[PDB]
Ligand binder design. Sequence first.
Ligand SMILES: [Zn+2]
Lengths: 206, 37, 122, 46, 48, 180
Amino acid sequence: MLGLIGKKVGMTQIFQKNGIVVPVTVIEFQPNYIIGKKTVDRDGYSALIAGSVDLKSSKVSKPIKGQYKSLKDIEPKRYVIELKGLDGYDAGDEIKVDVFKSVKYVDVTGTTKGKGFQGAMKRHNFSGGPSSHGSKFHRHLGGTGQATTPARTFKGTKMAGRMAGNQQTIQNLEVVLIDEEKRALLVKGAVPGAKGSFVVVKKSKK
Amino acid sequence: MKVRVSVKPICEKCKVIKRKGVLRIICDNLKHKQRQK
Amino acid sequence: MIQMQTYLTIADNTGGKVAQCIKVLGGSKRRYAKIGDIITIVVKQAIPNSSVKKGDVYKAVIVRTSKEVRRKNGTYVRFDDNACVILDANLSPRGKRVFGPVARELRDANFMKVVSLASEVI
Amino acid sequence: RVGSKELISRWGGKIIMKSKFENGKIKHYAECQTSKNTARKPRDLF
Amino acid sequence: TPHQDLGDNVIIINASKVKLTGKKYQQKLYYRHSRYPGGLYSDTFRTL
Amino acid sequence: MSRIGRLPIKIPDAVKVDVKDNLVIVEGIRGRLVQDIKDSINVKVENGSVIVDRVLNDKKAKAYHGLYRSLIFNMVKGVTEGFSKSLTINGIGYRVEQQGNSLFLSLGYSTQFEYVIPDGISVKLDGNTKISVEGIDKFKVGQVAAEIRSLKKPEPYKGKGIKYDNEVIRRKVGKSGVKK
RNA sequence: UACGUUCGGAAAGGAUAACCGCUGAAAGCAUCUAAGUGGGAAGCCUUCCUCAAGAUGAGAUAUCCUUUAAGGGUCCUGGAA
RNA sequence: GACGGAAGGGUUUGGCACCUCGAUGUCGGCUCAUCGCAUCCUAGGGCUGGAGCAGGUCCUAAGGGUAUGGCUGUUCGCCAUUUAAAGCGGUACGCGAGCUGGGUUCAGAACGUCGUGAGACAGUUUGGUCCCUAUCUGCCACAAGCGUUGGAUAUUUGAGAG
RNA sequence: GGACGCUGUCUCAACGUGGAGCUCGGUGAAAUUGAAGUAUCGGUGAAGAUGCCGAUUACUUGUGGUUAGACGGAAAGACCC
RNA sequence: AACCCAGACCAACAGCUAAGGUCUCAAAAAUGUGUUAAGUGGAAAAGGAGGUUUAGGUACGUAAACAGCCAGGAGGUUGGCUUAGAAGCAGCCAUACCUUUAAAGAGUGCGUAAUAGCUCACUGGUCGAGUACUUAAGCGCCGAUAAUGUAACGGGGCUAAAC
Ligand SMILES: [Zn+2]
């Protein structure tokens, strides 16, 4: 599956030729290199290891350094992922942004924004109690279980706790524009993560 | 159609069979078809 | 964003002057109607001795809303009062003339005859 | 009435539904005259 | 001695060719529960 | 048991039969067919004829007697004369056509049905409303004819659909039969 | 943050429920079943997204280190947390 | 499908008085649900006295969904508009150490009825304190420690679960 | 009981403000308490089990939250006899 | 706790037995003759039932029974009718109605206003032994059907490790 490690620059909008506005998210692609390969007869499966923006030479541990010993003029890469079942490339290669030039839809994977310790009403769209008529119940859970059967709280009952921070992959984002000279992709819609967080863009499954 | 507990022939042309462990009636008069509950 | 209990100006010459929304059609929990939707109204005030009496229930189409709704080209049109037009059984305007402007989403919702009888389409 | 969209492929070919048969399976699928690419739902040919 | 571990170890080979009798091949069920409500999953001998 | 189980099997001259290790091969003018035979039943070829008997007298063996007799008989009649089952397409605007190893059916649906013909089986047309499936195996011929019929099962109000030729469709009435 | 924007419910495959079969007995016929062999649903199993080797059954690989090295932690400046 | 006959379900009104009166808080509404299928809708069928449309009856199927208001404390029901449908039940007639206190079931007062009277009434009307900082299990989240048989750093196959 | 006006009462919640809450330093209770290397399900039983049976699941130990249970705490039940 | 076996004076790293068990968790079984295909065993009714073992009746048969296959399946006669029709098949009555009789019923069903029309009992040929209806028992099948979780064998599993 064709994929790339990009950085979510932000959002904007563009004007189609006839006047229709399209809200887009912009992704900037630092150069991506193929660092190694995984093979079915040696690792158990076939995949390509892909890496991106470099690290500072004072903060590369020697295991990471030795990972790149045999590669020529490829500094250590901070973001490393795997692309399963891909061919047409080998160690030392380098993937342009134009691999999406023939693609209509993409999928983007990133780390969603963190919202801290969040309550039930924000986390699960719980309604609350009334704010008047004598109520002493505003944004609490309400009841949680049943009385004596089962005499416990079922596993998975939704309560308060931390919200967001998980990975998430959003599907079928239309591809609006590709700009090779500035290494940018413009997709239509929202992309998980805060500004400057790093996403992975894959060719759409459908 | 007539998922019943007593399945009996209705006309002389109805016939009794047993299929995969249930008792059934089959006939030309499809209105007579039956299976035990 | 017309919901239930909203007051509306009847913008045609049937006789009614104020209508009240009592249902938003086409959807189970549907809560808001926009320009070009059909609602069920009761008449709360009418011109005396007209063909429309106070307290009758009809279907009406929304022609002006006070909350702006996005269009494809990015433009938003926000009127200054909420207004509707009464319809007969065929989902066609019961009246013969329409007062004031209407919004052009009627065009897309296929109310061409309301659009034509309007004075200005914005 | 926004003009009835002509049921056209992204490659300018008409899209027509055929019913393959294979091994007890009726299959419905969408076929493009110009490019003969077989897909199964015209969503995938627009 | 039941207290302690004094028996030998066992390697089973050809474990995929055990034969059953009756309709067990179609009817024996292996159940499991995820501990979440309603999360009861069955699995017949074939599929397992 | 019953006489079909014990009735002897004649062998046509052009047809050869052979039995070995729970298997039977029947090679004829038009093809070769194979069959499994269960342990409890014994199949013998003697004097240009086939005989079947049972080592046991359990009811499974009783049924097997007739089952394998009939199969081997249909296995021999196929390699000599082949099996053929025919069909008729009746109804306004219903058509059938052939291209290579597939049939195209126009049966009122908004799509024209293609139909791959499985190997080992031939299809014959008579105009555009009559079909005849021919082949070496009665089982396969019946299967194909059945699946084609299932493509558009007949109906009783007007006889429309794809019917077996030998079948008789019971018929009902609609509007005018209920006339008072 | 929604009242806003965008996207999502799939397509395909496997095994099945009721049902319809084909070939055929016991029971010369007949019969969807007893030997076999097929179709068949928002259900079941794969497929989509997320968590996941405390899976103690603790997996697999690439690189670094060989008497305290590799590496990690504390402290400090902070954040997209 | 009458007249009769045989069962299951444990939800209705009851029977019994076995646990609890050195206290097991009682009806509805709010919030949050989870499960059963005897299926309201969507899905797959058999037969129709099923032309078509629309149904009737029966079988399979619990994945998802299953309305907003008027009256009443009401569950229920009726009614107004909708909707593909406005399902039936269990869970202390789910859920008050989560909320409300309109109803019921205290002391005020009034009406009708009963009583000579004090008062009484599953008759009515009006007013009337809803307490507790979570030790344990359970659940929602996040860490410390160690293990994974030399010790570490990245990338991941996936049982299993949502 | 109805109407006008007005409004976050509500559709439908969002953001901000002050005191608590959270972390650290100082001072320092309480009701309660047979103890405790105190899980779940289907059962059984003084008829609703953390302690019994069979099976399933679960590394050790804390912190911030939530009240389903421990027929929770509080008052030798006020109702009934 | 109330059922079955059995009355604890104390001690022993002895033996034989009761109830209940002897694949395994879990200390203890093997062989003989049959039955069961439903995991029945390891819940249950009215009723339905070409499941099967064994035993016994009544029909019927090597002088050809049953099923299939090939024929006739009629003439008098629209049986008289009720009715409008009823021709065998709305409905009344019997059909002690006869003949050619191989055998043909005042017709078994389907379907026609009414027939018409298609079929059957009925009997003849091809085939070649048990068949067709019942009775008593031994095991089985459906009926079988609630709500936290397989949950009506204690579990694993068992075609015996079931009866
Ligand atoms: Zn019949």
